[PDB]
Design a protein around this ligand. Structure first.
Ligand SMILES: Cc1cc(NC(=O)c2cc3c(COc4ccccn4)nn(-c4ccccc4)c3s2)n(C(C)(C)C)n1
Ligand SMILES: [Mg+2]
Ligand SMILES: [Zn+2]
Length: 313
């Protein structure tokens, strides 16, 4: 009960900001995640020994890939933490509990290949799940770890509540399928415009949680420019490896994934900010006004990519 986590002074201050970077010391990331759960949820909501065992099994089941790794998991969870702390009264105790777990687990056992590549490869997972292929794999990896001995962090919930939180976690993990984002943001835009958006309608909540999951997942585009720029190397290292794997199947990859067309990267980023990121953080800010800093930092990075194109860095 009386065993609270502390951070060094700089981290204790900067962890509250949306643009926090968790740093290069892997061995601090678990303690950072627990601190976030304790302040977002209470020191009571999880048994520390089960939580710690859960965290280390989740880490063990992330792979050594350039971008979709353990650091991305904790980074995505930190963005969710920033959102929840800035919208303190909007979310139930179960939602606070579930969403941080969802973010830590959202890319479990990722191998750095898109749903498209699994389909063209004819991967067994694509036969099991025709849509959101990796995302249904990420959720079933989460259930697996929750069912290991000593790992049920939800042990003290009723059958009913346990089922609700696993249902919040499933929808949250599925929503990280960016193919689903486009329609989800379109629907929320319409509902906010006509004033029909209602946070007591469970199907409206689900959509808003869906958009938060996209916002946390893309949060690399909302860091300070030097972090955004270095993370972009990791993202493209996976894209180019997938492009190589397409070429091995006898398929010219889209130019984004072609390491022969690296010259097109800055214009590709410009495309992605205009088509995906800016609309995402725009609609999110309309619904949750305190998330404004995410939109502002996204516009800043858009401006920095325009400077790269115009040869100004
Ligand atoms: C339905 C869907 C959607 C997507 N594409 C994507 O998911 C992404 C694209 C990008 C880019 C660059 O985008 C562009 C856009 C057009 C031309 C060149 N490049 N940067 N980041 C990024 C940047 C920062 C942080 C996270 C992600 C992302 S995530 N696919 C594929 C088939 C997997 C590509 N299928
Ligand atoms: Mg994913
Ligand atoms: Zn992700």
């Amino acid at each position: 009960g009386l065993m609270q986590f502390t951070l060094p002074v700089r981290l204790c201050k900067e962890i509250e900001l949306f643009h926090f970077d968790i740093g290069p010391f892997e061995n601090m990331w678990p303690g950072i995640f627990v601190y976030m759960v304790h302040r977002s949820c209470g020191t009571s909501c999880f048994e520390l020994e089960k939580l710690c065992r859960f965290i280390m099994s989740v880490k063990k089941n992330y792979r050594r890939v350039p971008y979709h790794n353990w650091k991305h998991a904790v980074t995505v969870a930190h963005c969710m933490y920033a959102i929840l702390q800035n919208n303190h009264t909007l979310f139930t105790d179960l939602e606070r509990k579930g969403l941080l777990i969802a973010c830590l687990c959202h890319d479990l056992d990722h191998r750095g290949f898109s749903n498209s590549y699994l389909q063209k490869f004819d991967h067994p997972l694509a036969a099991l799940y025709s849509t959101s292929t990796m995302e249904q794999h990420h959720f079933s990896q989460t259930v697996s770890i929750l069912q290991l001995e000593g790992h049920n962090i939800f042990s003290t919930l009723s059958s009913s509540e346990y089922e609700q939180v696993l249902e919040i976690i499933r929808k949250a993990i599925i929503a990280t399928d960016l193919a689903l984002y486009f329609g989800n943001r379109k629907q929320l835009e319409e509902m906010y415009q006509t004033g029909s958006l209602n946070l007591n309608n469970q199907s409206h909540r689900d959509r808003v949680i869906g958009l938060m999951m996209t916002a946390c997942d893309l949060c690399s585009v909302t860091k300070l420019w030097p972090v955004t720029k270095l993370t972009a190397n990791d993202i493209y290292a996976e894209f180019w490896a997938e492009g190589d794997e397409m070429k091995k199947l006898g398929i010219q990859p889209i130019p984004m994934m072609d390491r022969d067309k690296k010259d097109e990267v800055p214009q590709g980023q410009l495309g992605f900010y205009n088509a995906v990121a800016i609309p995402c953080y725009t609609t999110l800010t309309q619904i949750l006004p305190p998330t404004e800093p995410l939109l502002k930092a996204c516009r800043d990075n858009l401006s920095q990519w325009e400077k790269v194109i115009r040869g100004e860095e």
